[PDB]
Structure 1
Amino acid sequence: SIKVAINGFGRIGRLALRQIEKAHGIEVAAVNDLTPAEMLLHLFKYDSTQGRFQGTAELKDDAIVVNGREIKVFANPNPEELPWGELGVDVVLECTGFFTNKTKAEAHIRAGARKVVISAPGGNDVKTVVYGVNQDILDGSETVISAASCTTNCLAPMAAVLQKEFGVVEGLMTTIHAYTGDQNTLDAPHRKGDLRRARAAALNIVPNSTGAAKAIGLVIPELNGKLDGSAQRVPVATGSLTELVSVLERPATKEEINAAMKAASSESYGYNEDQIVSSDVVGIEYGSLFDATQTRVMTVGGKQLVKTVAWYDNEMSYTCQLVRTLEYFAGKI
């Protein structure tokens, strides 16, 4: 069994534990956060958007017992100091939001873990994997990898189909995204100086940057430098979508685009034809859910603008992609 430690027992970290409990041959030996075990256990059991944990979870001294198995709990904010080698940790899921580059994530390796998966973009010098698009770039010799962002896992399969079947000249993305924990509850100073994330999360449409489109070349080299975009955070607590407006290399119709997406569907990339809304993707296990109902092709003379839209639960969709990537990576190491 591959032993996992979760660093940062937050939204992604706790959902990752839920998904890993369902995965054979991989188990979480430890979690680390900033708080006593009682707090972590409570938040694991009870979840405002993802529902009650559907298993048993009990408290023990400096440990939680999940489905009858003990998971040690630590509270050390500095990863290099954690007893990963001493516990026999194979892979750390780095989910704190504070160690999202190679140099910082490698602290887990100095602590004795064999591998790290960052639950976020990790820079250009770590292999970046959207499961179902480019996991074959891993051979197991990597030490630190990235599972990209939630938006990258939504955008990439949609962009891959467009590039493969039509060719992409260029594109601009907008993700309409659930608010997240990096926004304030009420208007207040923001630690990272972001005047827009400073604002009350559940009261506002909040423009904000995202690198998901700009960095797409790490996942789909044929799209390198061809896409850009940004985000609008809105008052849903989870559930998001990505719109892509593209110029393609050949003419296209709505029906041809939709058929190509359906033909590419998989456990990671779903295909939808129902008139759904964001609450309907909460808890889905696709990394991306293409919505054929929103496809649009604007034609003026010989020039076309193409809109394609995919949903994602930025929490659970990304988490399932993260665990698929971890499982594949763990088979290679």
Structure 2
Amino acid sequence: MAVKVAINGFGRIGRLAFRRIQEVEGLEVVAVNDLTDDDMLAHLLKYDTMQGRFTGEVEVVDGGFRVNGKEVKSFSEPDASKLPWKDLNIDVVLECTGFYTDKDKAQAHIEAGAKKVLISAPATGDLKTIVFNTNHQELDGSETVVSGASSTTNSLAPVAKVLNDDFGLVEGLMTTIHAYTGDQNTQDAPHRKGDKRRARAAAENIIPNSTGAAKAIGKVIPEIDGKLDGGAQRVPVATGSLTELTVVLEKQDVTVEQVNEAMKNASNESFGYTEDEIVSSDVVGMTYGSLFDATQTRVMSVGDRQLVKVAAWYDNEMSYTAQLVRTLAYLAEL
């Protein structure tokens, strides 16, 4: 009575998805794939700088590793098509490598014998893109390859839904103050992608960087396609981020208290609500996809012209991971 999951890419997302899946009955990681030995894998599962020590027991054994009395088969294969997914009976591949972010590229897992693929990032192609608790009812089981969207898109989507539904979204800009990630360099150095900002010492700088999140929000919410854009600022915290959205609305005479009350009313397991004066380190490890922060809501009015600004915290690691694993369980049921 268990969905067989494979994780491809035992990185920040793959390993935390593993932690998360240890709490979900009939979701079972049976295999992992990465570019390293089992020793490295076990070690990175047990010890995690920002996320804390793994909550149980990990042992390096023959096939891969032993976790809480259950065998996880391990692989070191960089080509997905060469994976023994048929032999292992893989129900869902959690695609967390970063190198398969596309319907066609990700098809490789289907070939290998897996039935479904959920990608842990935006992907290109004829795919559904899903934010759990905003978007997931759009799934139905016809789907073969699915995208779980991005960390920022999951912090942003439910905020933007309330704004448009209650106020009419005219247009908006976003800046996310985002923790630095592994694709940024440790020291100033050539960047494999040619990006002169990601090339810079990650933990020593405020770094402007591109994001597709707001420009691509149409994918999870069609009613506001092309109404939002924005960028990121990468700063020196290792995880935990903040999304800031500035919008023009159709409804006039909107107040700070109307905005906060309408977000609080939309709150759920995915969309948290707070009025405490928290900081980034306080959301590290949290499982809400987006935590709306009422202390940061601002309204600028001049005559009949208004600018409305809001902000929501997210552990770009764990908040995204928890949303990804919610979508996985729902996807798997269908």
Q: Give, in whole Å, the separation in 1 of the partners of 2:288 and 2:135.
A: 16
**Matches for 1:1-333 after TM superposition, within 5 Å:** 1-123=2-124, 125-251=126-252, 252-332=254-334
Q: Give the secondary structure class of the aligned counterpart of 1:250.
A: coil
**Letter of the aligned partner of 2:69 in structure 1?**
G
User: Does the CA contact (< 8 Å) of 2:132 and 2:326 recur in 1?
Assistant: yes
User: Does the CA contact (< 8 Å) of 2:120 and 2:149 recur in 1?
Assistant: yes
Mind listing any 5+ residue stretches in structure 1 that lack a counterpart?
Answer: none
Q: Give, in whole Å, the separation in 2 of the partners of 1:67 and 1:287.
A: 27
Q: Give the secondary structure class of the aligned counterpart of 2:269.
A: coil
Q: Give the secondary structure class of the aligned counterpart of 1:165.
A: helix
TM (norm. structure 1) is: 0.99
Deviation at 1:123, TM superposition (A): 2.0
Percent identity of paired positions between Structure 1 and Structure 2: 70
User: Does the CA contact (< 8 Å) of 1:156 and 1:219 recur in 2?
Assistant: yes
**Letter of the aligned partner of 1:32 in structure 2?**
N
User: Does the CA contact (< 8 Å) of 1:124 and 1:218 recur in 2?
Assistant: no
Q: Give, in whole Å, the separation in 1 of the partners of 2:327 and 2:64.
A: 27
Q: Give, in whole Å, the separation in 2 of the partners of 1:105 and 1:212.
A: 21
**Letter of the aligned partner of 1:306 in structure 2?**
V
Q: Render the CA deviation track for 1:69-112: whole Å, top value 9, x for unaligned.
A: 00001001110110101100000000001110111111000111
Q: Give, in whole Å, the separation in 1 of the partners of 2:183 and 2:126.
A: 25
User: Does the CA contact (< 8 Å) of 2:90 and 2:115 recur in 1?
Assistant: yes
Q: How well do the aligned residues superpose, as a CA RMSD in angstroms? A: 0.6
Deviation at 1:124, TM superposition (A): 5.0
User: Does the CA contact (< 8 Å) of 2:103 and 2:125 recur in 1?
Assistant: no
User: Does the CA contact (< 8 Å) of 1:37 and 1:62 recur in 2?
Assistant: no
Q: Give the secondary structure class of the aligned counterpart of 1:103.
A: helix
Q: Give the secondary structure class of the aligned counterpart of 1:18.
A: helix
**Letter of the aligned partner of 1:330 in structure 2?**
A
**Letter of the aligned partner of 1:246 in structure 2?**
V
Q: Render the CA deviation track for 1:309-329: whole Å, top value 9, x for unaligned.
A: 000000000000000000000
Q: Give, in whole Å, the separation in 2 of the partners of 1:18 and 1:127.
A: 25
**Letter of the aligned partner of 1:129 in structure 2?**
I
User: Does the CA contact (< 8 Å) of 2:21 and 2:27 recur in 1?
Assistant: yes
Deviation at 1:264, TM superposition (A): 0.3
User: Does the CA contact (< 8 Å) of 1:295 and 1:307 recur in 2?
Assistant: yes
User: Does the CA contact (< 8 Å) of 1:209 and 1:231 recur in 2?
Assistant: yes
Q: Give, in whole Å, the separation in 2 of the partners of 1:140 and 1:57.
A: 34
**Letter of the aligned partner of 2:327 in structure 1?**
T
Could you list the runs of 4 or more consecutive aligned residues of structure 1 that deviate by over 4 angstroms after TM superposition?
Answer: none
Q: Give, in whole Å, the separation in 1 of the partners of 2:104 and 2:27.
A: 26
May I ask how many residue pairs the two structures share in their alignment?
332
User: Does the CA contact (< 8 Å) of 2:104 and 2:125 recur in 1?
Assistant: no
Deviation at 1:285, TM superposition (A): 0.2
Deviation at 1:281, TM superposition (A): 0.3
Deviation at 1:62, TM superposition (A): 3.6
Deviation at 1:56, TM superposition (A): 1.1
Q: Give, in whole Å, the separation in 1 of the partners of 2:292 and 2:235.
A: 20
User: Does the CA contact (< 8 Å) of 1:36 and 1:62 recur in 2?
Assistant: no
